[PDB]
Design an enzyme around this catalytic site. Structure first.
Site, PDB file in Angstrom:
ATOM      1  N   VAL A   1       1.881   6.950   1.358  1.00  0.00           N
ATOM      2  CA  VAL A   1       1.058   5.915   1.923  1.00  0.00           C
ATOM      3  C   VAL A   1      -0.364   5.918   1.376  1.00  0.00           C
ATOM      4  O   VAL A   1      -0.993   6.971   1.213  1.00  0.00           O
ATOM      5  CB  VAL A   1       1.043   5.950   3.447  1.00  0.00           C
ATOM      6  CG1 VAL A   1       0.390   4.673   3.957  1.00  0.00           C
ATOM      7  CG2 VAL A   1       2.451   6.044   3.989  1.00  0.00           C
ATOM      8  N   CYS A   2      -0.883   4.709   1.122  1.00  0.00           N
ATOM      9  CA  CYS A   2      -2.242   4.533   0.643  1.00  0.00           C
ATOM     10  C   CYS A   2      -3.102   3.954   1.750  1.00  0.00           C
ATOM     11  O   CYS A   2      -3.072   2.764   2.020  1.00  0.00           O
ATOM     12  CB  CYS A   2      -2.312   3.699  -0.658  1.00  0.00           C
ATOM     13  SG  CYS A   2      -3.968   3.657  -1.422  1.00  0.00           S
ATOM     14  N   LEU A   3      -3.818   4.831   2.421  1.00  0.00           N
ATOM     15  CA  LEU A   3      -4.669   4.474   3.559  1.00  0.00           C
ATOM     16  C   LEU A   3      -6.008   5.224   3.475  1.00  0.00           C
ATOM     17  O   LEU A   3      -6.049   6.415   3.266  1.00  0.00           O
ATOM     18  CB  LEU A   3      -3.922   4.783   4.896  1.00  0.00           C
ATOM     19  CG  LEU A   3      -4.600   4.272   6.174  1.00  0.00           C
ATOM     20  CD1 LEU A   3      -4.703   2.760   6.164  1.00  0.00           C
ATOM     21  CD2 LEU A   3      -3.788   4.716   7.387  1.00  0.00           C
TER      22      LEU A   3
ATOM     23  N   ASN B   1       0.791  -1.242   0.000  1.00  0.00           N
ATOM     24  CA  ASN B   1       0.000   0.000   0.000  1.00  0.00           C
ATOM     25  C   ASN B   1       0.800   1.256   0.000  1.00  0.00           C
ATOM     26  O   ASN B   1       0.280   2.336   0.302  1.00  0.00           O
ATOM     27  CB  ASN B   1      -1.018   0.037   1.125  1.00  0.00           C
ATOM     28  CG  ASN B   1      -1.848  -1.185   1.141  1.00  0.00           C
ATOM     29  OD1 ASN B   1      -1.776  -1.970   2.079  1.00  0.00           O
ATOM     30  ND2 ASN B   1      -2.610  -1.377   0.075  1.00  0.00           N
TER      31      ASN B   1
END
Length: 160
Positions: free
Chosen positions: A94-96, A87
């Site tokens: 960051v992919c959140l 992610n």
């Protein structure tokens, strides 16, 4: 007041709360301006890997970038250097879900929550939204290998 005023007042409050109490091992400090003054819009943070996990031992450096419309908008979080993780974009971003306005972002979310959220993401990737082909593929195709590379990474980022 201007947009930034709101952002700054909140950030200042974030700082106080952080210094007052925060998870052990974590680090979150505003950067310095060329003139020595604190830059609340840019924070240098560090996330420790969780014990019992392949991330254990590592201290992952992350930059927290806030816009003028914070907390209406979430901060941009990026690992520096970029990490091997399904992610995490190659850029280190960051992919959140909580870091996406249109998703799970809520102005009420604190730096502390963010950090802890990222920490949990590390050991629990979101298969739904891959951000890094390599890490994602391996994660799914061979966890042993995945775990193997994660550990190496941790070691690489272990303090001394």
């Amino acid at each position: 007041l201007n947009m930034s005023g709101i952002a700054l007042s909140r950030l200042a409050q974030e700082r106080k709360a952080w210094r007052k109490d925060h998870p052990f091992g974590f680090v979150a400090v505003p950067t310095k301006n060329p003139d020595g003054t604190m830059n609340l819009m840019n924070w240098e943070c560090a996330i420790p890997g969780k014990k019992g996990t392949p991330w254990e031992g590592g201290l992952f450096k992350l930059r927290m970038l806030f816009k003028d419309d914070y907390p209406s908008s979430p901060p941009k979080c990026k690992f520096e250097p970029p990490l091997f993780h399904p992610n995490v974009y190659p850029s280190g971003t960051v992919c959140l879900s909580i870091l996406e306005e249109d998703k799970d972002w809520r102005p009420a979310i604190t730096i502390k929550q963010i950090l802890l959220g990222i920490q949990e993401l590390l050991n629990e990737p979101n298969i739904q939204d891959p951000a890094q082909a390599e890490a994602y593929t391996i994660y799914c195709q061979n966890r042993v290998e995945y775990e193997k590379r994660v550990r190496a990474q941790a070691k690489k980022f272990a303090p001394s």
